[PDB]
Amino acid sequence: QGMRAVILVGGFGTRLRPLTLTTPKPLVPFCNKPMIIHQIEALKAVGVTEVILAVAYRPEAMKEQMDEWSRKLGVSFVFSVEEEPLGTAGPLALARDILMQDDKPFFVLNSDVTCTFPMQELLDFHKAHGGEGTIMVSQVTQWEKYGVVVYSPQNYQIERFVEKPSRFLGDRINAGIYIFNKSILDRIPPIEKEIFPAMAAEGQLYAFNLEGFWMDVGQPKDYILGMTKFIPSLVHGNRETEAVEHQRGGRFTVIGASLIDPSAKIGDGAVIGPYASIGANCVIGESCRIDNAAILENSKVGKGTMVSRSIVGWNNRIGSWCHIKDISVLGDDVEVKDGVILIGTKVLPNKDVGEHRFEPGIIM
Amino acid sequence: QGMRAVILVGGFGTRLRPLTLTTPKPLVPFCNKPMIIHQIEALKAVGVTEVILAVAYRPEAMKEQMDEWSRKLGVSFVFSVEEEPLGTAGPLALARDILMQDDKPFFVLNSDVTCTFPMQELLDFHKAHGGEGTIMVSQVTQWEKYGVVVYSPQNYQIERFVEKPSRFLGDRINAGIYIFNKSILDRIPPIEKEIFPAMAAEGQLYAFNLEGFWMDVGQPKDYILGMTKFIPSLVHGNRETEAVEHQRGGRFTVIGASLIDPSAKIGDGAVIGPYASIGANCVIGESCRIDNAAILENSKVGKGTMVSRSIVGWNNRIGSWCHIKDISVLGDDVEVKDGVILIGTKVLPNKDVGEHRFEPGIIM
């Protein structure tokens, strides 16, 4: 009888390859949590009970037992969506059968959306609406570059979907966070964007304008930019003069806001740059520069290295005086010798690096 | 009471990366069989009972249930070797405990050895020898380049191991196929390989000269070279005017010896080049050129393409008029459009290729 939701995660994770080989794309950590745990937490803030995960391939990719978060938080994942090759309609194909006597509209979310997540949508748009909160929109500067403009007139109702419009109809873009009523479910074998054109034809499709940030985290560059946009929004959310985290293992300075895992050891004279994240049990040397970069799980970092606009693996062991900058992702259990300069090179897991790379490329 | 053996497979498979992500390095197919099946068949030709596999990392890497070959052939794998970080002594660390009351000397083999496999070694060197067939040697043209020369005098006994010798002591090189007696087992905590200097100190180490080919299959280039040396040695082994395989689905011509899986379909006017292998259910177009290349498992190939000195994935789907040459390895479930020219580029699994690449490199 409790409120339920569906999350569309079906994909391969090909774009974010260099660090998705070890763990699936949904559960690659962002800031300090797996990429989906943010959405489960927001849906709990709504007050949902269980989440319907829609995986296109490898449903038993070790995710079931890796989901330790399932026992906590009082949220149970069923993993009931196994997809044969059909159209791009998750709920229509598999989740239509499983409803278990719902009573409230169920949310629909992507896996690469990062926002302030306004969780009043169940209560909002309740003023005698059929299919409340049917679509969610946000402002974009490039009205024509992204395309797919959802025109929102003065009335909170949408009637036309135009792709690459010549007219300046509006700056609204489909955020990808949907909520539909139970009656929406209709058996449509493979399908036109989940019957959105008809949904507007009966004129029961509403849009919610979003003031917060929005972007698709599908690439490492988008990963870094999402980090730099999302960190300032967490000032009232989590625990962490710039006092985001100042004294952990020694008297070190932080230029801007950053997320420092309490179990980590920063060192003595490190300079944690703006919008940086550090995972548990991470060790940072006596003097370091973590500038707009993420350090995930148990990693060791020597003395004097600079990690700028980059990521490191899970059990990665970084040299002492190296210099890692630009958009370069290091896979799992990588090791780099002293005094190496990796500039925008993605290394495969378990590799070893001992030579300079001044140009973008891949190390196998 | 039956004869047993130990296979050292402990490794990462890093060198043969682009096609070892899907399946572990020991079970990447060679010609028509997994790389361990040749070893197991030779050891059966000896008459062994069980094989002790020594895997360094990920013992349960889905190999146990994927080893369908265990139920057949009447050979049982125990997978009892899980390795904590110690020295390079597999049998001394774990396999020392498990002997199961042996009565005959047990073989020790690598995983990247390809030879004629003389399986009379149990009977050979039995003329009152202690530790019969302690080492195996083969001729190499580059006496000093490879180094580690095992000097074999007129007597079948070795007394000195010299690394990078200045003197032309001999062309023998340690093949890596060992057989030791039960009494050899001595608890040596981390380890001069198998205590070879002492083994020569008591002077009971013998060498067997090999007339056949020998090379380590650790790289795709070495993979191709090993295939082109090993195919002619199978003329008396398996089922397949050049009549290695001439008429399967149409009247096609084969220039040299090749391995054509019976379930495959060749087409109508293909030209299967010298020393090529094709897996089961593979489909080859109307006119093709498979020149010194390996096609693994279910693959589709269009019309007029050329696969020269290359490998393709498991479920690979190849375009019609493409041109794949040089040492290029295609991962699992890759797809290439029509008229692409991949020259020595390794693609990652599940990727898609639609653009030319005239230089060596990697596609993510």
Short mmCIF file of all heavy atoms in Angstrom, two decimals, chain A residues 12 14 17 58 62 346 348-351 362 364, chain B residues 12 14 17-18 62 346 348-351 362 364:
data_model
loop_
_atom_site.label_atom_id
_atom_site.label_comp_id
_atom_site.label_asym_id
_atom_site.label_seq_id
_atom_site.Cartn_x
_atom_site.Cartn_y
_atom_site.Cartn_z
N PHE A 12 24.91 0.57 -20.40
CA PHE A 12 26.18 -0.13 -20.39
C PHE A 12 27.27 0.60 -19.62
O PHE A 12 28.24 -0.04 -19.20
CB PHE A 12 26.66 -0.37 -21.83
CG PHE A 12 26.12 -1.62 -22.45
CD1 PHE A 12 25.54 -1.58 -23.71
CD2 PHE A 12 26.18 -2.83 -21.78
CE1 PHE A 12 25.03 -2.73 -24.29
CE2 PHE A 12 25.67 -3.98 -22.36
CZ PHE A 12 25.10 -3.93 -23.61
N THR A 14 29.23 2.76 -20.99
CA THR A 14 30.36 2.81 -21.91
C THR A 14 31.09 4.14 -21.85
O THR A 14 32.32 4.19 -21.92
CB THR A 14 29.89 2.53 -23.34
OG1 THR A 14 29.21 1.26 -23.38
CG2 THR A 14 31.06 2.49 -24.30
N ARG A 17 33.88 4.78 -19.03
CA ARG A 17 34.50 3.46 -19.03
C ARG A 17 35.62 3.28 -18.01
O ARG A 17 35.58 2.30 -17.25
CB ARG A 17 35.01 3.13 -20.44
CG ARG A 17 35.74 1.80 -20.52
CD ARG A 17 34.80 0.64 -20.28
NE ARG A 17 33.99 0.34 -21.46
CZ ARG A 17 33.15 -0.68 -21.55
NH1 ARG A 17 32.99 -1.53 -20.55
NH2 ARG A 17 32.45 -0.85 -22.67
N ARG A 58 22.86 -7.60 -17.64
CA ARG A 58 23.49 -8.19 -16.46
C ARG A 58 22.77 -7.82 -15.17
O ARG A 58 23.33 -7.12 -14.31
CB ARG A 58 24.99 -7.82 -16.42
CG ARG A 58 25.35 -6.34 -16.26
CD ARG A 58 26.76 -6.05 -16.73
NE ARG A 58 26.95 -6.38 -18.14
CZ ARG A 58 27.13 -5.48 -19.10
NH1 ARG A 58 27.16 -4.18 -18.84
NH2 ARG A 58 27.30 -5.89 -20.35
N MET A 62 26.54 -8.77 -9.56
CA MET A 62 27.00 -8.66 -8.18
C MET A 62 26.40 -7.47 -7.46
O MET A 62 26.77 -7.19 -6.31
CB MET A 62 28.54 -8.60 -8.08
CG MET A 62 29.26 -9.72 -8.81
SD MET A 62 30.96 -9.28 -9.23
CE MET A 62 31.64 -10.90 -9.59
N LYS A 346 43.65 8.18 -19.48
CA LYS A 346 42.86 7.21 -18.74
C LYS A 346 43.60 5.88 -18.75
O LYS A 346 43.89 5.33 -19.82
CB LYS A 346 41.48 7.06 -19.36
CG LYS A 346 40.64 8.32 -19.31
CD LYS A 346 39.69 8.40 -20.49
CE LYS A 346 40.27 9.27 -21.58
NZ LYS A 346 39.27 9.56 -22.64
N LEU A 348 43.89 1.80 -17.60
CA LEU A 348 43.03 0.66 -17.33
C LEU A 348 43.34 0.07 -15.95
O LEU A 348 44.42 0.31 -15.40
CB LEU A 348 43.19 -0.39 -18.42
CG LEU A 348 42.35 -0.23 -19.69
CD1 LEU A 348 40.87 -0.26 -19.36
CD2 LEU A 348 42.69 1.03 -20.45
N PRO A 349 42.41 -0.69 -15.37
CA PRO A 349 42.63 -1.20 -14.01
C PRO A 349 43.83 -2.13 -13.92
O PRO A 349 44.21 -2.79 -14.88
CB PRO A 349 41.33 -1.94 -13.71
CG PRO A 349 40.32 -1.33 -14.60
CD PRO A 349 41.05 -0.97 -15.85
N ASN A 350 44.43 -2.14 -12.73
CA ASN A 350 45.54 -3.01 -12.35
C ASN A 350 46.81 -2.76 -13.15
O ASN A 350 47.80 -3.49 -12.98
CB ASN A 350 45.15 -4.49 -12.45
CG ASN A 350 43.82 -4.79 -11.77
OD1 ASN A 350 42.77 -4.36 -12.24
ND2 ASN A 350 43.87 -5.51 -10.67
N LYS A 351 46.83 -1.74 -14.00
CA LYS A 351 48.02 -1.40 -14.76
C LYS A 351 49.07 -0.78 -13.84
O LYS A 351 48.86 -0.58 -12.64
CB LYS A 351 47.65 -0.44 -15.90
CG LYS A 351 48.66 -0.38 -17.03
CD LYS A 351 48.96 -1.77 -17.57
CE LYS A 351 50.15 -1.74 -18.52
NZ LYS A 351 50.39 -3.07 -19.14
N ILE A 362 45.42 6.72 -23.90
CA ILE A 362 44.99 5.60 -23.07
C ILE A 362 46.18 4.69 -22.81
O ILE A 362 46.95 4.38 -23.73
CB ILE A 362 43.84 4.81 -23.73
CG1 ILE A 362 42.60 5.70 -23.88
CG2 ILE A 362 43.52 3.57 -22.93
CD1 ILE A 362 42.40 6.25 -25.27
N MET A 364 47.03 0.91 -21.66
CA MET A 364 46.44 -0.41 -21.49
C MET A 364 47.28 -1.28 -20.56
O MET A 364 48.10 -2.07 -21.01
CB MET A 364 46.28 -1.11 -22.85
CG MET A 364 45.43 -2.37 -22.78
SD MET A 364 43.67 -2.03 -22.94
CE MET A 364 43.61 -1.39 -24.61
N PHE B 12 47.73 -11.96 -13.94
CA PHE B 12 46.71 -10.94 -14.12
C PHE B 12 46.13 -10.89 -15.52
O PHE B 12 45.01 -10.40 -15.70
CB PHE B 12 47.28 -9.56 -13.76
CG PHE B 12 47.01 -9.14 -12.35
CD1 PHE B 12 47.29 -10.00 -11.29
CD2 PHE B 12 46.47 -7.90 -12.07
CE1 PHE B 12 47.05 -9.62 -9.99
CE2 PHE B 12 46.23 -7.52 -10.76
CZ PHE B 12 46.51 -8.38 -9.72
N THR B 14 47.34 -9.00 -17.81
CA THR B 14 47.40 -7.59 -18.20
C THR B 14 47.89 -7.42 -19.63
O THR B 14 47.38 -6.57 -20.37
CB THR B 14 48.30 -6.83 -17.23
OG1 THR B 14 47.83 -7.00 -15.89
CG2 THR B 14 48.32 -5.35 -17.57
N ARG B 17 45.30 -7.81 -22.74
CA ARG B 17 44.15 -7.15 -22.12
C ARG B 17 42.91 -7.11 -23.00
O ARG B 17 41.84 -7.55 -22.53
CB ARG B 17 44.54 -5.74 -21.67
CG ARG B 17 43.38 -4.95 -21.10
CD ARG B 17 42.92 -5.52 -19.77
NE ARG B 17 43.79 -5.12 -18.67
CZ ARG B 17 43.57 -5.40 -17.40
NH1 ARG B 17 42.50 -6.08 -17.02
NH2 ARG B 17 44.45 -5.00 -16.48
N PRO B 18 42.95 -6.62 -24.24
CA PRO B 18 41.69 -6.22 -24.91
C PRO B 18 40.65 -7.32 -25.03
O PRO B 18 39.49 -7.01 -25.30
CB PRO B 18 42.16 -5.76 -26.30
CG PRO B 18 43.59 -5.43 -26.11
CD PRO B 18 44.10 -6.42 -25.13
N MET B 62 34.25 -16.90 -11.71
CA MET B 62 33.29 -17.63 -12.53
C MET B 62 33.94 -18.78 -13.28
O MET B 62 33.28 -19.41 -14.12
CB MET B 62 32.56 -16.71 -13.53
CG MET B 62 31.79 -15.58 -12.87
SD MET B 62 31.81 -14.07 -13.86
CE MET B 62 30.55 -13.11 -13.03
N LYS B 346 43.20 -1.65 -30.81
CA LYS B 346 42.50 -2.53 -29.89
C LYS B 346 41.28 -1.80 -29.35
O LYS B 346 41.41 -0.72 -28.77
CB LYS B 346 43.42 -2.96 -28.75
CG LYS B 346 44.61 -3.79 -29.20
CD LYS B 346 45.80 -3.57 -28.29
CE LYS B 346 46.76 -2.55 -28.88
NZ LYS B 346 48.04 -2.51 -28.13
N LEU B 348 37.74 -1.75 -26.93
CA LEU B 348 37.23 -2.28 -25.68
C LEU B 348 35.87 -2.94 -25.90
O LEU B 348 35.20 -2.67 -26.90
CB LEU B 348 37.14 -1.17 -24.64
CG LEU B 348 38.41 -0.84 -23.84
CD1 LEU B 348 38.87 -2.05 -23.05
CD2 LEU B 348 39.53 -0.32 -24.71
N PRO B 349 35.44 -3.81 -24.98
CA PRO B 349 34.18 -4.53 -25.18
C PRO B 349 32.98 -3.61 -25.27
O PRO B 349 32.96 -2.51 -24.71
CB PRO B 349 34.09 -5.44 -23.95
CG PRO B 349 35.49 -5.61 -23.51
CD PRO B 349 36.18 -4.32 -23.81
N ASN B 350 31.97 -4.06 -26.03
CA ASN B 350 30.67 -3.41 -26.16
C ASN B 350 30.76 -2.06 -26.86
O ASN B 350 29.74 -1.38 -27.02
CB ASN B 350 30.00 -3.26 -24.80
CG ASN B 350 29.90 -4.57 -24.05
OD1 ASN B 350 30.91 -5.15 -23.65
ND2 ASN B 350 28.68 -5.05 -23.86
N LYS B 351 31.95 -1.66 -27.29
CA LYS B 351 32.11 -0.41 -28.00
C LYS B 351 31.51 -0.51 -29.40
O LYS B 351 31.10 -1.58 -29.86
CB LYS B 351 33.58 -0.01 -28.06
CG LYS B 351 33.83 1.47 -28.32
CD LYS B 351 33.03 2.33 -27.37
CE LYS B 351 33.04 3.79 -27.81
NZ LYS B 351 32.37 4.67 -26.81
N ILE B 362 44.09 2.95 -29.16
CA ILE B 362 43.06 2.28 -28.38
C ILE B 362 41.77 3.06 -28.49
O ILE B 362 41.77 4.30 -28.44
CB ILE B 362 43.48 2.15 -26.90
CG1 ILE B 362 44.73 1.26 -26.77
CG2 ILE B 362 42.35 1.60 -26.06
CD1 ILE B 362 46.01 2.04 -26.58
N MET B 364 38.16 3.59 -26.68
CA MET B 364 37.32 3.37 -25.51
C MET B 364 35.85 3.56 -25.85
O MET B 364 35.15 4.36 -25.23
CB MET B 364 37.71 4.32 -24.37
CG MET B 364 37.47 3.72 -22.99
SD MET B 364 38.81 2.70 -22.37
CE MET B 364 40.08 3.94 -22.13
#
